[PDB]
Design an enzyme around this catalytic site. Structure first.
Site, PDB file in Angstrom:
ATOM      1  N   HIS A  42       0.775  -1.258  -0.053  1.00  0.00           N
ATOM      2  CA  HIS A  42       0.115   0.066  -0.056  1.00  0.00           C
ATOM      3  C   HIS A  42       0.686   1.105   0.030  1.00  0.00           C
ATOM      4  CE1 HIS A  42       0.453   0.390   4.520  1.00  0.00           C
ATOM      5  NE2 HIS A  42       0.182   1.809   4.016  1.00  0.00           N
ATOM      6  N   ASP A  88      -0.577  -7.225   1.948  1.00  0.00           N
ATOM      7  CA  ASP A  88       0.431  -6.061   1.832  1.00  0.00           C
ATOM      8  C   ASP A  88       1.563  -6.264   2.141  1.00  0.00           C
ATOM      9  OD1 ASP A  88       0.555  -3.260   1.772  1.00  0.00           O
ATOM     10  OD2 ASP A  88      -0.146  -2.981   3.721  1.00  0.00           O
ATOM     11  N   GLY A 186       4.901   0.047   6.516  1.00  0.00           N
ATOM     12  CA  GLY A 186       5.764  -0.546   5.410  1.00  0.00           C
ATOM     13  C   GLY A 186       7.191  -0.815   6.416  1.00  0.00           C
TER      14      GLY A 186
END
Ligand SMILES: CO[C@@H]1C[C@H](C(=O)Nc2ccc(-c3ccccc3S(C)(=O)=O)cc2F)N(C(=O)Nc2ccc(Cl)cc2)C1
Ligand SMILES: [Ca+2]
Ligand SMILES: [Ca+2]
Lengths: 234, 50
Positions: A42, A88, A186
């Site tokens: 994302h 993700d 992340g």
């Protein structure tokens, strides 16, 4: 990171920071090797072009230990969907190799079975990043880390308004005001075992930050070990 | 491997009902077959001192 503590010299060497055209951080990443960075899928749909900065701890003054690397190849999981935030995960191949030094070193990639039986069964993991220190706050100038307890799967499925897939896991506190937050996405979630840190998760999402009855949601690295290995060879 | 990780520094496997230790990339298994020795500078998973 809401709460937690400042990463002191050499304490979070695997932390990477994704920076946009304005050289502003917007997501984190984990150093896996001299050429690879692990991050969230994302985070890619969150910026036109970007580079990766390693060795930074304070985005203000210039220490001299910081280093910027351009991205050569972006490998985003093809199943990632903004609709469910499942899968993700993304891997970045850098154009030039990272020079390990103080504050710059890779986190270890563990073996699947061992990680699930020995790492994820640990009481806590460690999350780090330059993210907001408050839900409505602003991007942190200093790199922070936070010890987050592993949360029972059934416990957080009930706590989440969204479906928690097998590619996700929860960590954090129910009521205590400490959690990762926007900007940390992340980034690394690592688990310590006999003084060695293994990457176990990727900061993914959450409903707000450090909110009561809610936990931080992370991408379960063990669910993608084969995918990561394949991405690191091509 | 259920008893103190088979006394292994890192990875532990129970092959033929026997503990077999192994290490992450950048480490070599020690002579005792349990410890993991960094093959060089800045081994993975270690906080940096210098
Ligand atoms: C409002 O939250 C604000 C804004 C932002 C955010 O975008 N949230 C966020 C993302 C994805 C989903 C979601 C998940 C599954 C299926 C559908 C959806 S959906 C239809 O897109 O809504 C839900 C969400 F709240 N956020 C964080 O990410 N913060 C944070 C990140 C990591 C961690 Cl470890 C802790 C905290 C705080
Ligand atoms: Ca700096
Ligand atoms: Ca909470």
């Amino acid at each position: 990171i809401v709460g937690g503590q400042e990463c002191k010299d050499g304490e979070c060497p695997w932390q990477a920071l994704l920076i946009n055209e304005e050289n502003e951080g917007f997501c984190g990443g984990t150093i896996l090797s001299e050429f690879y960075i692990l991050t969230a899928a994302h985070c890619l749909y969150q910026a036109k072009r970007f580079k990766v900065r390693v060795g930074d701890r304070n985005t203000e003054q210039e220490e001299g230990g910081e280093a910027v690397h351009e991205v050569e190849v972006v490998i985003k999981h093809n199943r990632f969907t903004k609709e469910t935030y499942d899968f993700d995960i993304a891997v970045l191949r850098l154009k030039t190799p990272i020079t390990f030094r103080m504050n710059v070193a890779p986190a270890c990639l563990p073996e699947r079975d061992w990680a699930e039986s020995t790492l994820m069964t640990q009481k806590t993991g460690i999350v780090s990043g330059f993210g907001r220190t408050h839900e409505k706050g602003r991007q942190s100038t200093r790199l922070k880390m936070l010890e987050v307890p592993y949360v029972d799967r059934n416990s957080c499925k009930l706590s989440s308004s969204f479906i928690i897939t097998q590619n996700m896991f929860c960590a954090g506190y129910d009521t205590k005001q400490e959690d990762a937050c926007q900007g940390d996405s992340g980034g690394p979630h690592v688990t310590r075992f006999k003084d060695t840190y293994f990457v176990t998760g990727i900061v993914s999402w959450g409903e707000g930050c450090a909110r009561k009855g809610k936990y931080g949601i992370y991408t379960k690295v063990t669910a993608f070990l084969k995918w990561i290995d394949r991405s690191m060879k091509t | 491997c259920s008893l103190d990780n088979g006394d292994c520094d890192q990875f532990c496997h129970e092959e033929q009902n026997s503990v077999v230790c192994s290490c992450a990339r950048g480490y070599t298994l020690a002579d005792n077959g349990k410890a993991c020795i960094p093959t060089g500078p800045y081994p993975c998973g270690k906080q940096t001192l210098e």
